[PDB]
Design a protein around this ligand. Structure first.
Ligand SMILES: CCCCCCCCCCCCC/C=C/[C@@H](O)[C@H](CO)NC(=O)CCCCCCCCCCCCCCC
Ligand SMILES: CS(=O)(=O)Nc1ccc(C(=O)NCc2ccc(Cl)cc2Cl)cc1
Ligand SMILES: CS(=O)(=O)Nc1ccc(C(=O)NCc2ccc(Cl)cc2Cl)cc1
Ligand SMILES: CCCCCCCCCCCCCCCC
Ligand SMILES: CCCCCCCCCCCCCCCC
Ligand SMILES: CCCCCCCCCCCCCCCC
Ligand SMILES: CCCCCCCCCCCCCCCC
Ligand SMILES: CCCCCCCCCCCCCCCC
Ligand SMILES: CCCCCCCCCCCCCCCC
Ligand SMILES: CCCCCCCCCCCCCCCC
Ligand SMILES: CCCCCCCCCCCCCCCC
Ligand SMILES: CCCCCCCCCCCCCCCC
Ligand SMILES: CCCCCCCCCCCC
Ligand SMILES: CCCCC
Ligand SMILES: [K+]
Ligand SMILES: [K+]
Ligand SMILES: [K+]
Ligand SMILES: [K+]
Ligand SMILES: [K+]
Lengths: 281, 276
């Protein structure tokens, strides 16, 4: 019976599908609730600023203004600073930023603040990713291994002193707590504090940057080292290390959350079986 | 000796580390070679456009323009982006970790919800993507049961036909998941043939720069287009997940082959020089 388990599998996949479809719907409405209003008030008060310079300069064709703004937004994607009071410019593809860029490719973070424009840079970026993503996966695996054996030494010491008058499977709970607590300190709390000072971000934007980056979502709305400010350069290589170890950390954290869902799925699947078989006595 | 294996482990990690560090250095120089000039020609021809706009419109003083560009840069930080369907898109870019970033939350609440929505959605979507990989795997296993029967009752036999099979996977795979969709993006999105394949790889590898986005521009789209792209992504992500994993196993093999070739080169330089 080979197709007996395959029919059981497709039943599992399709239910997970519908839960994903419905999880996307719930999230969609919650983001639309949170983000539609602040969008409208900004898109109306930008038409307000529009008309203040639409009619205060009639001698501009005013059909070429919205063509001007296209030619600025089209060129702002490359990272321009089109100003006369600041016309000398730092490079976005210098010795170190293309090193950053290559990092966003293999880590699949892909902030996108810097992206290739040449047809050659795109063809190399395709090849660089198809090889670099598997390669970096081995490094990130070993970093997970090394960081695992360090925590294994830690709980060998802590699961010895917490042996009072003790069960094996309940101290597993105590261990995962100290992993989450210490983990959020070294990989979320402490770095975000450093970003809050150095990057000048808010306390929320820093943690937001941490989570968006280490989950490899990589929106790119906030990027460490993305401004020109001063950059000790003590700073940027520490951030390379943070990412290398922080990605390994969320990889385990996300995997833990996945197993929790597996458990909650079993508990809720049997609760519905309970609710049915009772049906009010 | 428990620390004897751990030292063997750290020696494995550190070599992989240096291969990654040196892979980043090669890439950095190659991108700096490919993208430094294209940057200069655009920075010079954007100063051309700027002083062109003061002369071809004497109306505009040089002081108003710097105020205009601040008001545009300020407006780039927000600009409907959050309508009924695009926040559905957005939620997709979160759980898939593609995260194009053309749409990103601005409210402090939308950021906090995005943190919660991701920490729960990414594992959830992983299970879906795992089952999609399973199902799509058993489909192709049915296919190679029928194709490894007609090529295995005649000419050259087993252990070299693994190679032929994985080529069939890559060849048809690139058709259904890279070639065919990129053709559809080329027409509907108006992208070049290169940009479409560029979009495909950057999206299905979950890099997702966001420099090109399907359905991201303001165009009349057919009703079937965007939902087919969801299906493409659902099944295409499962495809590169296997493809990337294959490439990973190739590197393991190549690493073994190059590790023993160095042992060869050493063992001959050894007893060539031992001969005096
Ligand atoms: C496209 C960007 C160019 C990146 C090319 C980087 C390749 C770097 C040169 C390979 C040798 C690395 C240093 C030597 C390490 C060995 O002592 C060691 C065993 O002793 N090998 C490995 O650890 C395992 C290392 C095996 C890694 C093989 C990576 C496969 C690259 C395939 C690219 C083919 C291009 C052909 C022209 C170079
Ligand atoms: C404005 S710029 O883009 O043109 N210049 C730079 C921008 C960023 C960095 C950098 O290294 N940030 C830390 C970092 C490292 C690796 C990875 Cl993968 C991600 C991150 Cl955030 C360097 C130069
Ligand atoms: C300014 S906008 O908000 O209107 N831009 C948009 C861009 C894309 C879409 C959309 O549905 N694309 C198909 C799709 C689906 C899921 C995933 Cl994960 C990725 C992709 Cl590309 C909608 C709007
Ligand atoms: C796993 C990561 C979850 C993120 C929780 C971080 C809590 C920070 C609180 C700051 C005050
Ligand atoms: C040990 C990891 C420490 C990470 C701190 C990163 C700060 C930026
Ligand atoms: C600008 C400096 C950024 C490059 C830092 C190189 C360090 C590599 C990672 C070390 C950990
Ligand atoms: C197998 C189907 C499992 C359905 C249960 C999904 C659990 C999601 C709970 C999310 C809590 C917030
Ligand atoms: C933050 C959004 C949370 C969304 C939680 C959705 C919960 C959906 C529960 C689905 C229950 C299905 C029962 C199937 C049992 C056979
Ligand atoms: C059950 C559905 C739970 C939805 C939770 C939404 C809470 C948003 C928090 C924003 C602050
Ligand atoms: C999984 C649920 C984790 C919820 C943690 C959210 C912490 C955000 C704090 C922002 C202030
Ligand atoms: C059009 C040329 C695309 C090149 C794809 C790279 C194949 C490896
Ligand atoms: C095949 C997958 C169907 C996904 C349903 C969501 C369709 C959204 C399209 C928006 C118009
Ligand atoms: C059409 C231009 C293609 C340029 C990409 C080729 C890159 C050559 C490989 C470099 C290895 C060191
Ligand atoms: C058959 C592949 C579906 C996406 C075009
Ligand atoms: K933009
Ligand atoms: K991204
Ligand atoms: K990404
Ligand atoms: K990713
Ligand atoms: K992005």
């Amino acid at each position: 019976s080979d197709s007996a388990i395959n029919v059981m599998k497709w039943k599992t996949v399709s239910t997970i599908f519908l839960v994903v479809v419905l999880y996307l719907i719930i999230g969609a409405t919650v983001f639309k609730a949170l983000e539609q209003p602040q969008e409208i008030s900004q898109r109306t008060t930008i038409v307000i600023q529009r008309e203040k310079f639409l009619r205060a300069h009639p001698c501009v064709s005013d059909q070429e203004l919205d063509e001007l703004i296209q030619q600025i937004v089209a060129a702002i994607n490359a990272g321009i600073i089109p100003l006369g009071a600041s016309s000398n410019q730092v490079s976005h593809w210098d010795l170190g930023s293309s090193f950053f860029f290559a990092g966003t490719v293999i880590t699949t973070i892909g902030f996108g603040n810097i992206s290739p424009r040449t047809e050659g840079g795109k063809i190399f970026c395709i090849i660089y990713a198809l090889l670099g993503i598997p390669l970096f996966g081995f490094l990130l695996a070993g970093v997970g291994d090394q960081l695992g054996t360090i925590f294994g030494k830690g709980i060998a010491k802590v699961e010895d002193t917490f042996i009072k008058w003790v069960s094996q499977t309940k101290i597993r709970i105590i261990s995962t707590i100290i992993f989450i607590l210490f983990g959020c300190v070294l990989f979320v709390a402490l770095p975000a504090v450093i970003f809050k000072h150095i990057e000048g971000w808010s306390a929320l934007d820093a943690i937001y940057f941490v989570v968006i980056t280490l989950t490899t979502i990589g929106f790119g709305d906030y990027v460490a080292g993305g401004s020109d400010i001063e950059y000790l350069d003590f700073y940027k290589p520490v951030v390379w290390f943070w990412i290398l170890v922080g990605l390994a950390y969320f990889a385990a954290v996300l995997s833990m959350i996945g197993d929790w869902l597996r458990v909650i799925a079993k508990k809720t699947k049997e609760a519905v079986g309970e609710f049915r078989a009772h049906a009010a006595e």
